[model samples]
Target chain A: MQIFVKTLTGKTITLEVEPSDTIENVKAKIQDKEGIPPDQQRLIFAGKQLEDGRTLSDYNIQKESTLHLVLRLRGC
Target chain B: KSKDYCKVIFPYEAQNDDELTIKEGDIVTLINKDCIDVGWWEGELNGRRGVFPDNFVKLLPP
Candidate 1:
């Protein structure tokens, strides 16, 4: 299934993924494509934060669902 | 992460609960520009977040 990773700045990145994929798995893919570190990325769906060990199916994410990405603020 | 900002060119009164009310000349942080084709865009103004009409503001370059 395909889902959209929506960034805070209104940017949307389409990701092809499986329902069985873990949140950390998706975060890894995000790091690969957007160069954002997994630890700095937070994914939310339906206003709930997704856990790293949880699967997309565990959150009931369907095709075309949008996962909101909120970047963690870090100090340099 | 980079943020997108826009300047409201016209005043808009939100007609729905999820819509945002914007005043002319107010600068807002754009949170979702991907839905412009649907005639709405999401933004944050004065700490309030909601959707507004795409035509209500002019997107400014970061």
Candidate 2:
């Protein structure tokens, strides 16, 4: 299925993955495209976290579903 | 010491020559003030809030 992700900087990226793919795989795809640091990434969907090791089916995501990846910065 | 107050002026308007129309998200140039020196100012324009540089405006005639 195809998933659409949007970054805080107003960028949108689409990725295609199989049903077996986990949330970690999607995070890797986003990191490859946006250069987002793995530690500073937070995946939010329907106002909840898609924590690591969770599968796409856990969130009931379908083809062409959109998710927001918020980037967190460290330090003041 | 006299403070340097900026004003908005539209050279083309005869009656409202001193008045200028601006809208939200409009990009305007800073004529004489630096971007860092200009303070934030927002006003109603065309029924929308417009945020612009203070140095780009001139005083309207009383």
Candidate 3:
């Protein structure tokens, strides 16, 4: 299925992925495409984080679902 | 779209091939602060463009 991603910077892009794909899977592309580093790709859906070791299918992710992406900031 | 080039106020390490190794007093052309992830900015130094810490550079006047 095709996944659509939106960012705080007004950038929008689509991804070709499977429901079995992990959040880390989608994050890799986001890091490159959106410049949000892998370790900092803090994505939220329905007010919670999309954790590791969990598939999109487990999260009930659907096509065209707008996953909230955050560039999780840390120490200097 | 203006190129807000800034001067390197301090030195920065080359964390990756893409991140330019900057030195104190080097002139770096700021590409976009909004494009940076966090606490960082993309700049071009000595013709090499890379991400550097925002604190390392002093934004120059227009």
Candidate 4:
């Protein structure tokens, strides 16, 4: 499925992904696109924070879903 | 800002699942050009949405 990853900068990154994929995998893709480290990335959807260990299927992510990407400060 | 539109200036074949294959003269709905400098711009063509090379299309001014 295709999902949208919107950053605080309002940039929308369209990614082709699968429900079986983990949040960590999504973060890694984002890292490749935005140069942000996966560990420094925070993903949120449906008002709930997504854990790296969890799959999109675990969160009930559907096709065309828009997930928010929040960048974490280096120290925090 | 409103969505932008662009006309394909050259033909392009999608290399990945997240890309849109475009033909010369096809009109594409420019969805996101934030990464234009990065060479990839998101757009919707014929009801399909995906990214393509920024230089592949000529932006139609609003």
Candidate 5:
């Protein structure tokens, strides 16, 4: 399935993976591309959490869907 | 002179906007010798926080 991901800074990128891929795999791919730590990442689609260990099918995600990945940085 | 407390002045019309989301107030920070006041002004957008001159802001009608 093809997934379009958008970062908090408004950067968007696309990736194609099989439906069997776990959320962790997707996170690893995003970390490799964006250099953002997986632990610091928060993926939300339709305002819901896309957590790790969950399969793409578990979320009812389909091919060619768009997801938003927000990176939060703490400040004083 | 005693420390002055200034309020933010909105320069544009705001309707259906979140008042809590609107950041307008005195911005205080500790400087070398004293607490510096950045002067306050109503601002939109996420990252436009700073102290501007008092003249730059105008009083709005209630």
Candidate 6:
């Protein structure tokens, strides 16, 4: 996708993603700003929920708008 | 000719090692705005240098 998206179970939110930045870090940041739990918080890309343990490199989520999280939806 | 520069109005992350990722309020020297490809620019920051999208930065007075 040309834009970054973190589609949830039903809700969708546009957010930022960087290679060095991990989903957990982003979760924490989002938590601080929105009061959402960093752990309970779920982020979806490529239709799959982003894991808190993995880095942004798992997918071709480069700063360039050339690739997206090539994934399938899996229940968290 | 004197070198010109710009300041970042927004934060950006580098997708590649060659891309100049910066935080908002960071400063960069505009080495070239004439990117071979449109929407990109070359700049130097904190003694490190890289190319990035131009819309994220604003040209500042030298």
Interface RMSD of every predicted model, in angstroms: 12.9, 19.2, 13.4, 15.9, 14.4, 12.4
lDDT of 3 at A34: 67
Best candidate per DockQ, number?
Answer: 1
Candidate 5 Cα deviation (angstroms), residue A48: 2.1
Tens digits of per-residue lDDT for model 4, A2-64: 988655444778987777777778778888888998767656665455667767787787888
Predicted structure with the largest TM-score when compared to the true one: 1
Residue lDDT tens for model 2, A1-76: 8877644343567787888977677778777977876666656554345678777788887778776543332110
Pull out the clashing pairs in model 2: B7-B57, B7-B58, B8-B57, B8-B58
lDDT of each: 0.64, 0.50, 0.61, 0.63, 0.49, 0.52
B29-56, model 1: which lDDT tens digit per residue?
7675663243466777667777655543
Encode model 4's per-residue lDDT on B1-62: one tens digit a residue: 57766676446454446556566767777666663244456777767777655543446676
Supply candidate 2's per-residue lDDT for A39. 60
In angstroms, give how far residue A33 of model 2 lies from its true place: 1.5
- Could you tell me every candidate's TM-score relative to the true structure? 0.51, 0.49, 0.47, 0.49, 0.50, 0.39
Q: Native-vs-model 4 lDDT?
A: 0.63
Give one digit per residue, the lDDT tens place, for model 5 in A1-76.
7887754344668886888777778789888988877777656553345667677777777778777543342210
State fnat for each of the candidate structures. 0.00, 0.00, 0.00, 0.00, 0.00, 0.00
Q: What value does the TM-score of chain B take for model 3?
A: 0.65
Model 1 per-residue lDDT tens digits across residues A32-74 = 9999988776565643556787777777777788764443322
Descending-TM-score candidate ranking: 1, 5, 4, 2, 3, 6
Writing each residue's lDDT as its tens digit, candidate 2 over B1-62 gives 13243344311111122233452233344333333423334444444443443422444343
- Which 10 successive residues of model 4 chain A have the least lDDT summed? A67-76
Give stretches of model 3 more than 4 Å off: A71-76, B1-62
Q: For model 6, how does the per-residue alpha-carbon lDDT over A1-76 read when each residue is reduced to its tens digit?
A: 2234332211334556556776677667666755656555445443234566876567555553321221122211
Off by over 4 Å in 5: B1-62
Q: Which 10 consecutive positions of candidate 6 chain B have the poorest summed lDDT?
A: B7-16
